Coordinates of C-alpha atoms and ligand atoms in Angstrom, one line a residue:
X1 CA 0.0 0.0 0.0
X2 CA 1.4 3.4 -1.2
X3 CA 1.2 6.5 0.9
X4 CA -0.7 9.6 -0.2
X5 CA 1.0 13.0 -0.7
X6 CA -1.2 16.1 -0.4
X7 CA 0.3 19.6 -1.0
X8 CA -2.3 22.3 -0.2
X9 CA -1.5 25.8 -1.6
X10 CA -3.2 29.2 -1.5
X11 CA -4.2 28.8 -5.2
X12 CA -3.8 25.1 -6.2
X13 CA -3.9 21.7 -4.4
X14 CA -1.7 18.9 -5.7
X15 CA -2.3 15.2 -4.8
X16 CA -1.2 11.7 -5.8
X17 CA 0.7 8.7 -4.6
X18 CA 4.1 8.4 -2.9
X19 CA 6.5 6.8 -5.4
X20 CA 5.1 8.7 -8.4
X21 CA 7.0 11.3 -10.2
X22 CA 4.1 13.7 -10.5
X23 CA 0.8 14.3 -8.7
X24 CA -2.3 12.9 -10.4
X25 CA -4.6 15.5 -9.1
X26 CA -4.0 19.3 -9.5
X27 CA -7.0 21.6 -8.9
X28 CA -7.9 25.1 -7.5
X29 CA -8.2 25.6 -3.7
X30 CA -11.7 26.8 -4.1
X31 CA -14.8 25.9 -2.2
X32 CA -18.1 27.3 -3.5
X33 CA -21.5 27.5 -1.9
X34 CA -24.8 28.8 -3.6
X35 CA -25.4 32.5 -3.7
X36 CA -25.2 22.4 -2.2
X37 CA -21.4 22.4 -1.8
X38 CA -18.7 22.5 -4.6
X39 CA -14.9 22.0 -4.7
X40 CA -12.1 22.6 -7.3
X41 CA -12.7 22.7 -11.0
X42 CA -16.4 22.1 -10.6
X43 CA -16.5 25.1 -8.4
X44 CA -14.6 27.3 -10.8
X45 CA -17.0 26.7 -13.7
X46 CA -20.2 27.2 -11.6
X47 CA -18.9 30.4 -10.2
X48 CA -21.8 32.4 -11.8
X49 CA -24.1 30.9 -9.2
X50 CA -21.6 30.4 -6.3
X51 CA -19.9 32.3 -3.4
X52 CA -16.3 31.1 -3.7
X53 CA -14.1 30.5 -0.7
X54 CA -10.3 30.3 -0.5
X55 CA -9.5 28.4 2.7
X56 CA -5.7 28.8 2.5
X57 CA -4.6 32.5 2.6
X58 CA -0.9 33.2 2.2
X59 CA -0.2 29.5 2.7
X60 CA -2.0 29.3 6.1
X61 CA -5.4 27.5 6.5
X62 CA -7.9 30.2 7.7
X63 CA -11.1 28.1 7.3
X64 CA -11.1 24.6 8.7
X65 CA -14.6 23.6 7.5
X66 CA -13.9 24.5 3.9
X67 CA -10.5 22.9 4.2
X68 CA -12.0 19.6 5.5
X69 CA -14.2 19.6 2.2
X70 CA -11.1 20.0 0.0
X71 CA -9.4 17.0 1.6
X72 CA -12.7 15.0 1.4
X73 CA -12.9 15.9 -2.3
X74 CA -9.2 15.1 -2.8
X75 CA -9.6 11.5 -1.4
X76 CA -13.0 10.5 -2.7
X77 CA -13.4 12.4 -6.0
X78 CA -9.9 13.3 -7.4
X79 CA -7.8 10.3 -6.2
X80 CA -10.8 7.9 -5.7
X81 CA -9.3 6.2 -2.6
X82 CA -10.1 5.7 1.1
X83 CA -8.1 7.6 3.8
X84 CA -8.3 4.7 6.5
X85 CA -6.4 2.5 4.0
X86 CA -3.5 4.9 3.4
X87 CA -0.9 6.8 5.3
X88 CA -1.1 10.6 4.4
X89 CA 1.7 13.1 4.0
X90 CA 0.4 16.6 4.3
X91 CA 2.5 19.8 3.8
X92 CA 2.4 23.0 5.8
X93 CA 3.7 26.5 5.3
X94 CA 6.9 27.6 7.1
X95 CA 6.1 29.2 10.5
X96 CA 2.7 27.4 10.6
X97 CA 1.0 28.2 14.0
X98 CA 1.3 25.4 16.5
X99 CA -2.6 25.3 16.7
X100 CA -2.9 24.7 13.0
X101 CA -0.5 21.7 13.1
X102 CA -2.6 20.2 15.9
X103 CA -5.9 20.8 14.2
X104 CA -4.5 19.2 11.0
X105 CA -3.5 16.0 12.9
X106 CA -6.8 15.8 14.6
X107 CA -8.8 16.1 11.3
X108 CA -6.9 13.3 9.6
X109 CA -7.2 10.7 12.3
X110 CA -10.7 11.6 13.7
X111 CA -12.5 12.7 10.5
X112 CA -10.8 10.5 7.9
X113 CA -9.5 7.9 10.3
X114 CA -6.1 7.6 8.6
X115 CA -3.8 4.8 9.9
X116 CA -0.7 7.0 9.8
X117 CA 0.2 10.6 9.0
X118 CA 2.9 13.2 8.7
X119 CA 3.1 16.9 8.2
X120 CA 6.3 18.4 6.5
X121 CA 7.4 21.9 5.6
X122 CA 6.8 22.7 2.0
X123 CA 10.1 24.3 1.4
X124 CA 12.1 21.5 3.0
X125 CA 10.5 19.0 0.6
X126 CA 11.5 21.1 -2.4
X127 CA 15.1 21.0 -1.2
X128 CA 14.8 17.2 -0.8
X129 CA 13.4 17.0 -4.4
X130 CA 16.6 18.7 -5.7
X131 CA 18.9 16.2 -3.9
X132 CA 19.9 18.3 -1.0
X133 CA 19.4 18.4 2.7
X134 CA 21.1 21.7 3.4
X135 CA 20.5 24.9 1.4
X136 CA 18.1 27.9 1.2
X137 CA 14.8 27.7 -0.6
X138 CA 13.0 30.5 -2.2
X139 CA 9.3 29.3 -2.4
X140 CA 7.0 31.6 -4.3
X141 CA 3.5 30.4 -5.1
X142 CA 0.1 32.0 -5.7
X143 CA -0.3 33.6 -2.3
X144 CA 3.0 33.9 -0.4
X145 CA 6.8 34.0 -0.9
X146 CA 9.2 32.5 1.7
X147 CA 12.9 32.4 2.2
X148 CA 13.8 29.3 4.1
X149 CA 17.3 28.4 5.3
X150 CA 17.4 24.6 6.0
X151 CA 20.2 22.7 7.8
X152 CA 20.2 19.0 7.5
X153 CA 16.4 18.8 6.9
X154 CA 15.7 21.5 9.6
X155 CA 14.2 24.8 8.6
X156 CA 15.7 27.5 10.8
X157 CA 12.7 29.4 12.2
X158 CA 14.6 32.5 13.4
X159 CA 15.9 33.0 9.9
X160 CA 12.7 32.5 7.8
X161 CA 11.3 35.6 6.2
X162 CA 7.8 36.0 4.8
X163 CA 6.7 38.3 1.9
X164 CA 3.1 38.5 0.8
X165 CA 3.8 39.2 -2.8
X166 CA 3.3 36.3 -5.2
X167 CA 1.4 35.1 -8.3
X168 CA -2.1 36.6 -7.7
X169 CA -0.5 39.9 -6.9
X170 CA 1.5 39.8 -10.2
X171 CA -1.7 38.9 -12.2
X172 CA -3.5 41.9 -10.6
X173 CA -0.4 44.0 -11.4
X174 CA -0.4 43.0 -15.1
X175 CA -4.1 43.8 -15.3
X176 CA -3.4 47.3 -14.0
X177 CA -0.4 48.1 -16.2
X178 CA -2.3 46.7 -19.3
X179 CA -5.2 48.9 -18.2
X180 CA -3.0 52.0 -18.2
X181 CA -2.2 51.5 -21.9
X182 CA -5.9 51.2 -23.0
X183 CA -7.3 47.7 -22.3
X184 CA -10.2 47.0 -19.8
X185 CA -10.9 44.0 -17.6
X186 CA -14.3 43.7 -15.9
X187 CA -14.9 39.9 -15.9
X188 CA -13.5 36.9 -14.2
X189 CA -12.8 35.2 -17.6
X190 CA -10.7 38.3 -18.6
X191 CA -8.6 37.9 -15.4
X192 CA -8.0 34.3 -16.3
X193 CA -6.8 35.5 -19.7
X194 CA -4.3 38.0 -18.1
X195 CA -3.0 35.2 -15.9
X196 CA -2.4 33.0 -19.0
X197 CA -0.6 36.0 -20.7
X198 CA 1.5 36.3 -17.5
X199 CA 2.5 32.6 -17.5
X200 CA 3.2 32.5 -21.3
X201 CA 4.8 35.8 -22.1
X202 CA 6.3 37.4 -19.0
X203 CA 10.0 37.2 -18.1
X204 CA 12.5 38.7 -15.7
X205 CA 15.0 41.2 -17.2
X206 CA 18.6 40.9 -16.3
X207 CA 19.0 44.7 -16.1
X208 CA 15.6 46.3 -15.8
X209 CA 16.6 49.9 -16.7
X210 CA 18.5 48.7 -19.8
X211 CA 15.5 46.5 -20.8
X212 CA 13.2 49.5 -20.4
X213 CA 15.5 51.5 -22.8
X214 CA 15.4 48.6 -25.3
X215 CA 11.6 48.5 -25.1
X216 CA 11.3 52.3 -25.7
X217 CA 13.5 52.4 -28.9
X218 CA 12.2 49.4 -30.9
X219 CA 9.6 46.7 -30.8
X220 CA 12.1 43.9 -30.5
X221 CA 10.8 42.7 -27.1
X222 CA 7.1 42.7 -28.3
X223 CA 5.1 39.6 -28.3
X224 CA 1.4 39.0 -29.2
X225 CA -1.1 36.8 -27.5
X226 CA -4.0 35.4 -29.6
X227 CA -7.5 35.1 -28.0
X228 CA -9.9 32.3 -28.8
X229 CA -12.2 34.7 -30.8
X230 CA -9.2 35.7 -33.0
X231 CA -8.5 39.1 -31.5
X232 CA -4.8 39.7 -30.4
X233 CA -3.3 41.7 -27.5
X234 CA 0.3 43.0 -28.0
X235 CA 2.6 43.3 -25.0
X236 CA 5.9 45.0 -24.7
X237 CA 7.5 46.3 -21.6
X238 CA 4.7 44.8 -19.5
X239 CA 6.3 41.5 -20.1
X240 CA 9.1 42.2 -17.7
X241 CA 7.6 45.1 -15.6
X242 CA 5.2 42.6 -14.0
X243 CA 7.7 40.2 -12.5
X244 CA 10.1 43.1 -11.7
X245 CA 7.7 43.7 -8.8
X246 CA 9.3 40.6 -7.1
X247 CA 12.6 42.5 -7.0
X248 CA 11.1 45.9 -6.4
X249 CA 7.9 45.7 -4.3
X250 CA 7.5 49.5 -4.5
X251 CA 5.8 48.9 -7.9
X252 CA 2.9 47.5 -5.9
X253 CA 3.3 50.3 -3.2
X254 CA 4.8 47.8 -0.7
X255 CA 7.6 49.0 1.6
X256 CA 9.4 45.7 1.5
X257 CA 12.7 44.1 0.3
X258 CA 12.7 42.3 -3.1
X259 CA 13.1 38.5 -3.2
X260 CA 16.8 38.9 -3.7
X261 CA 17.4 41.0 -0.5
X262 CA 15.0 38.8 1.4
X263 CA 17.1 35.8 0.5
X264 CA 20.2 37.6 1.5
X265 CA 18.8 38.8 4.8
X266 CA 17.8 35.2 5.7
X267 CA 21.3 34.0 5.0
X268 CA 22.8 36.8 7.2
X269 CA 20.4 35.7 10.0
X270 CA 22.1 32.4 10.0
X271 CA 25.4 31.3 11.6
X272 CA 28.4 32.5 9.7
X273 CA 29.8 28.9 9.4
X274 CA 26.8 27.7 7.2
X275 CA 26.5 30.7 4.9
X276 CA 29.0 29.3 2.3
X277 CA 26.6 26.3 1.9
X278 CA 23.5 28.5 1.7
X279 CA 25.0 30.8 -1.0
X280 CA 26.0 28.0 -3.3
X281 CA 22.7 26.1 -2.7
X282 CA 19.9 28.6 -3.2
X283 CA 17.0 26.6 -4.6
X284 CA 13.9 28.2 -6.4
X285 CA 10.6 26.6 -5.8
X286 CA 7.0 27.3 -6.7
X287 CA 5.0 28.6 -9.8
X288 CA 6.0 32.2 -9.3
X289 CA 9.7 31.3 -9.8
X290 CA 8.9 29.9 -13.4
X291 CA 9.7 33.2 -15.2
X292 CA 12.5 32.9 -17.7
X293 CA 15.5 34.9 -16.6
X294 CA 14.7 34.7 -12.9
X295 CA 17.7 32.5 -11.9
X296 CA 20.3 34.7 -13.7
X297 CA 18.7 37.8 -12.1
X298 CA 18.8 36.3 -8.6
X299 CA 22.4 35.4 -9.2
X300 CA 23.3 38.8 -10.3
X301 CA 21.5 40.5 -7.5
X302 CA 22.8 38.3 -4.7
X303 CA 26.4 38.6 -6.1
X304 CA 26.0 42.3 -5.6
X305 CA 25.1 41.8 -2.0
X306 CA 27.3 39.0 -0.9
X307 CA 31.1 39.3 -0.3
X308 CA 33.1 39.5 -3.6
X309 CA 34.9 36.2 -2.8
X310 CA 31.7 34.2 -2.3
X311 CA 30.4 31.5 -4.7
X312 CA 26.8 32.2 -5.6
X313 CA 24.7 29.4 -7.1
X314 CA 21.0 29.4 -7.9
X315 CA 19.4 26.1 -8.6
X316 CA 16.2 26.3 -10.7
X317 CA 14.8 22.8 -11.3
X318 CA 12.8 22.6 -14.5
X319 CA 9.8 21.0 -12.7
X320 CA 9.9 23.4 -9.6
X321 CA 6.3 24.1 -10.1
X322 CA 5.6 20.7 -8.4
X323 CA 8.8 20.3 -6.4
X324 CA 7.1 20.5 -3.0
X325 CA 5.0 17.5 -4.0
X326 CA 7.8 15.5 -5.6
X327 CA 9.9 16.1 -2.5
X328 CA 7.0 14.6 -0.5
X329 CA 6.6 11.7 -2.9
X330 CA 10.3 10.9 -2.4
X331 CA 10.2 11.2 1.4
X332 CA 7.1 9.2 1.8
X333 CA 8.5 6.4 -0.5
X334 CA 11.7 6.0 1.3
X335 CA 12.1 2.8 3.3
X336 CA 13.9 4.6 6.1
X337 CA 11.1 7.2 6.4
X338 CA 8.7 4.3 7.2
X339 CA 9.0 4.4 11.0
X340 CA 8.7 8.1 11.3
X341 CA 4.9 8.3 10.6
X342 CA 2.5 9.1 13.4
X343 CA 0.3 6.0 13.9
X344 CA -3.4 6.0 14.8
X345 CA -2.0 4.1 17.8
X346 CA 0.3 6.9 18.8
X347 CA -2.5 9.5 18.3
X348 CA -5.0 7.9 20.7
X349 CA -2.3 7.6 23.3
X350 CA -1.0 11.3 23.0
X351 CA -3.7 13.4 21.4
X352 CA -3.2 16.1 18.7
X353 CA 0.0 17.5 20.4
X354 CA 2.0 14.5 19.3
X355 CA 2.7 16.3 16.1
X356 CA 5.2 18.8 17.7
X357 CA 7.4 15.9 18.9
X358 CA 7.2 13.6 15.8
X359 CA 7.2 16.3 13.0
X360 CA 10.0 18.7 13.9
Ligands
ATP401 N1 4.9 29.5 -16.0 C1 4.6 30.4 -15.0 N2 5.2 31.7 -15.0 C2 4.9 32.5 -14.0 N3 4.0 32.2 -13.0 C3 3.4 31.0 -13.0 C4 3.7 30.0 -14.0 N4 2.9 28.9 -13.8 C5 2.2 29.1 -12.7 N5 2.5 30.4 -12.2 C6 1.8 31.0 -11.0 O1 2.1 30.2 -9.9 C7 1.1 30.3 -8.9 C8 0.7 28.9 -8.5 O2 1.9 28.3 -7.9 P1 1.9 27.3 -6.8 O3 0.9 26.1 -7.0 O4 3.3 27.0 -6.4 O5 1.2 28.1 -5.6 P2 0.4 27.6 -4.4 O6 1.1 26.6 -3.6 O7 -1.0 27.4 -4.9 O8 0.3 28.9 -3.5 P3 1.3 29.3 -2.3 O9 2.6 28.6 -2.3 O10 1.4 30.8 -2.5 O11 0.5 29.0 -1.1 C9 -0.1 31.0 -9.7 O12 -0.1 32.3 -9.3 C10 0.3 31.0 -11.1 O13 -0.2 32.2 -11.8
CA402 CA1 2.8 26.2 -2.2

């Protein structure tokens, strides 16, 4: 019997079997209720008649009722299995409140009656998925960005930094800067178009001010996007102005450090003796790190911050859109992991608080 691996995100949930190289179920973290109860794709298409809920905000579960439905759906509808037959790996955000980890443990055992379970930190699993057990992860998804220094599988809590600027913010940004040049977006279908344009045509410029000058003197960086009806929207500097907001959050009116300085600042919060290993093992994870050019820009920017003698290395796995899950698929498949689960037996004995001592 293979374990189940469930990665729940602010925008998308990913689910499948430990031992597999990819999740079998990927669907929106949406729960909709009439203006009886809908979840996922189903819920996105019936949105005209539904009040849509997002139970995970910035990576943290804020609604446990809606969250319980997502997990129900995941097991019975998307994966078509039974929880009491399968050990379950769940993932959690870095710095997840102690109460949230307890409530999560309680729900699996008591609502779904799992035989065994575990909860792992999303960023740690992306590191594992790349072949490493020490390094720093930049995890940027739909809702939140984290910089997570990890030492031999342990995320260093004092050094983790959180930035609420990620994919949904960049889609809203692109809408806005496309609006300023003429276009108009009043419907939810039009937002989904902008999000597709973002994912297909945006990129990170190696030198922003130079790329801006390029864009102003010719149409060499222009690309067109063709709509189903046959109309086309043409995009120039908005291609790289949108993800520039990751490095300059001012563009969104945020008084915050860019993803480069956040990464640096986490490294500097760590012990001087491990920094060498962090600098050469900076791993990108998450959908918002998928922009072409992002690794070379991170490399450039961190080189400019770190000591001149330091080796800077940014690892950007091609499949990093799913690396959290894949990391989990690996862990949960390992033979040596097998006695690290929390058993139904251990739960009954100790309660929900056993999670703090078994999943550290
Ligand atoms: N090719 C791409 N280029 C740029 N952005 C992308 C690309 N593919 C997906 N994204 C963005 O990635 C986000 C989803 O990534 P991911 O599933 O890692 O996030 P999540 O886990 O749902 O959310 P979070 O980690 O913030 O809780 C969406 O905002 C999406 O627009
Ligand atoms: Ca995520």
